[PDB]
Each structure stands twice: as structure tokens, then as C-alpha cells.
Amino acid sequence: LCFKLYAKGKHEKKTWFESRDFCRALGGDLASINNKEEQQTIWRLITASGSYHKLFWLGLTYGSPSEGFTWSDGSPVSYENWAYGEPNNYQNVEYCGELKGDPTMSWNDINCEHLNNWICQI
Ligand SMILES: CC(=O)N[C@@H]1[C@@H](O[C@@H]2O[C@H](CO)[C@H](O)[C@H](O)[C@H]2O)[C@H](O[C@@H]2O[C@@H](C)[C@@H](O)[C@@H](O)[C@@H]2O)[C@@H](CO)O[C@H]1O
Ligand SMILES: [Ca+2]
Ligand SMILES: [Ca+2]
């Protein structure tokens, strides 16, 4: 699949569900990162755009209490790159996952209504 970053104006940021709908309207989904190669591809897109340290929705969303986090495209959550201490479900309201667009490419759980940039896969 091909990845595309969306870092529009800050008043153009979207919730997790709005971002999922945007990507699904293109016939795709929010990006799943299933291995280090995909991670590098996205990191290089970040460097090419020159937009460093920005946060982006990924396809991470909580499933049942038993499952924990899942990918919206149904891919397995085998590879994980959570930031240290994450997921921390801060204040019990963090059920979606974002990417921190710096070299570490780490993941964080955050409230799904938070406004973020996003990354689609097509
Ligand atoms: C600048 C600052 O002090 N931010 C605090 C939040 O931590 C940042 O959260 C963002 C989330 O996009 C990012 O992870 C930064 O690296 C953090 O410094 C803090 O958020 C809470 O703790 C985070 C570590 C993370 O788990 C986040 O999901 C969680 O809500 C909030 C709430 O304590 O306070 C901010 O001041
Ligand atoms: Ca993937
Ligand atoms: Ca968190």
C-alpha cells in the first residue's frame, strides 16, 4: 500500500473518526504500521515534507477490553512501537493511537476526539 501524509492547516485537523472517514472515502484506510520498513517509508515522507515533530493519526483504535488495541484495516498488531510508558490510557479516555513524527516514530494513545494530522494508506 501507498502512504500519504495529511498535515493541512491547524484548523483543518481532524478527529480519529473524521480521519478514518477521509481515508476510507478514498477507498483506503488510516495507515497501519506493521514493520520497520513501513515505519521508514513514513519517516522518509515526513523528512521530504519538512514537517518534523508533528503528530498524526494512525489506524490504531481500541477493540474489546480483552483485545486491547487493533488496526482499523484489520491487520495484526504484531509490531508495536509505543513510546515509553504508553499506552497509558491517561484519565481513562484514550482509545485511539497517534504517531509522533520524529525519528523515533513512537506511538501514543490519545482521546479519539483530539484534532490531529493523519496518514492514509491506499
Ligand atoms: C507539553 C506537555 O506538557 N504536554 C502534556 C501531555 O503530554 C504530552 O502529550 C502529547 C500527546 O500528543 C505527547 O505525547 C507529548 O510527548 C507529551 O509530552 C499530557 O498528556 C498525557 O501524557 C502523555 C505522556 C500522553 O500519554 C498523553 O496521551 C496523555 O494525555 C497532558 C495530560 O497530562 O498534559 C500536558 O501538559
Ligand atoms: Ca501496514
Ligand atoms: Ca497516552
Side-chain angles (χ1 to χ4, degrees):
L1 298 189
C2 302
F3 299 111
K4 183 174 177 61
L5 306 178
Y6 288 90
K8 303 194 183 183
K10 286 199 177 184
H11 58 285
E12 296 183 307
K13 287 182 183 175
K14 291 186 184 308
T15 69
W16 187 86
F17 300 96
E18 287 167 344
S19 298
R20 185 198 56 183
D21 292 347
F22 178 99
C23 300
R24 287 187 173 182
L26 300 168
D29 212 324
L30 282 166
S32 58
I33 301 179
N34 301 83
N35 51 67
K36 281 252 205 299
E37 183 169 2
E38 288 194 303
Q39 180 172 298
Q40 165 70 14
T41 298
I42 296 172
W43 171 241
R44 191 152 171 195
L45 290 175
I46 290 164
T47 72
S49 70
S51 60
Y52 300 102
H53 316 288
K54 292 201 154 188
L55 294 301
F56 296 88
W57 286 126
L58 301 179
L60 285 165
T61 179
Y62 221 75
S64 70
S66 188
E67 293 183 286
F69 271 99
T70 67
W71 289 112
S72 64
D73 68 0
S75 301
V77 184
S78 48
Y79 179 70
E80 296 183 88
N81 199 38
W82 297 106
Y84 175 59
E86 308 297 341
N88 68 354
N89 199 5
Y90 195 77
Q91 296 177 336
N92 297 93
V93 300
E94 303 198 313
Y95 295 108
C96 291
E98 65 177 3
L99 169 71
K100 179 175 294 188
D102 71 13
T104 72
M105 294 286 291
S106 61
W107 309 345
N108 171 51
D109 59 338
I110 193 162
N111 183 272
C112 298
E113 304 307 314
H114 184 72
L115 297 183
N116 256 341
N117 306 303
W118 65 95
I119 305 174
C120 296
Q121 62 188 27
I122 210 69

